[PDB]
Amino acid sequence: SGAKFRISLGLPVGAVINCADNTGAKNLYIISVKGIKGRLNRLPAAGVGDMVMATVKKGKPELRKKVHPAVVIRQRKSYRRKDGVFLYFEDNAGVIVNNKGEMKGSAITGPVAKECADLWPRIASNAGSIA
């Protein structure tokens, strides 16, 4: 099996990230992170491989005024990968999925973090490359 190790989160609630699928959504506005118990005044933050609730701000009007489950695939904050490498990406990105984990879209633009790849096998198959 193997569970995900802790990584630097970097993406709190209120962050707007790119939408890397082809659903017609251009960005995702993160409103919460799944599995976050929280603390007083602490913003729920998400890293790569984290499932979030997000609303698209620009894109198809049929997706706009709704809440979508999403999974972060790229992040601009450097995170240590248990073997020294501090990887970070050119931009924050995520894709729209459902609660089961199936991706609403059918393709992913750009790389996908290895943490997100082996946590969501549905996302990894659609991924063009893994970084």
């Binding site: 970070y88 050119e90 990105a93 750009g110």
Partner: protein
């Protein structure tokens, strides 16, 4: 003892050092420190920075004939056979060229006589 990486500067990166960059187009770079990384991020050419490996090789800082022929036996003739054929130099080949001349001439003359 892991993979050994090379930077924007071309220096050797040991495990547990530097950072790794993954662009959106799918290319992955690795840097030794923030000096080499920030030079890369400012679209700066490594061939114009005097401490970079790429510069030193461009400006050349600090920086025969072999031929062997062998004889192999081929399918049908051993090396001993081909040695004997090529070692018929002392008038053995001369005997072959003169016996060819007289035999071909006597066959040519007899062929003219065969017709009438």
């Amino acid at each position: 003892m892991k993979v050994e990486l090379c930077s924007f500067s071309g220096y050797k990166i040991y495990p547990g050092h530097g950072r790794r960059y993954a662009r959106t187009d799918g290319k992955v770079f690795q840097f030794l420190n923030a000096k080499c990384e920030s030079a890369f991020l400012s679209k700066r050419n490594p061939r114009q920075i005097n401490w970079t490996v790429l510069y030193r090789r461009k400006h050349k800082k600090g920086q025969t004939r072999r031929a062997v022929k062998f004889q192999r036996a081929i399918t049908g003739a051993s090396l001993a056979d081909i040695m004997a054929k090529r070692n018929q130099k002392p008038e053995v080949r001369k005997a072959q060229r003169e016996q060819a001349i007289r035999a071909a001439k006597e066959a040519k003359k007899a062929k003219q006589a065969s017709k009438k």
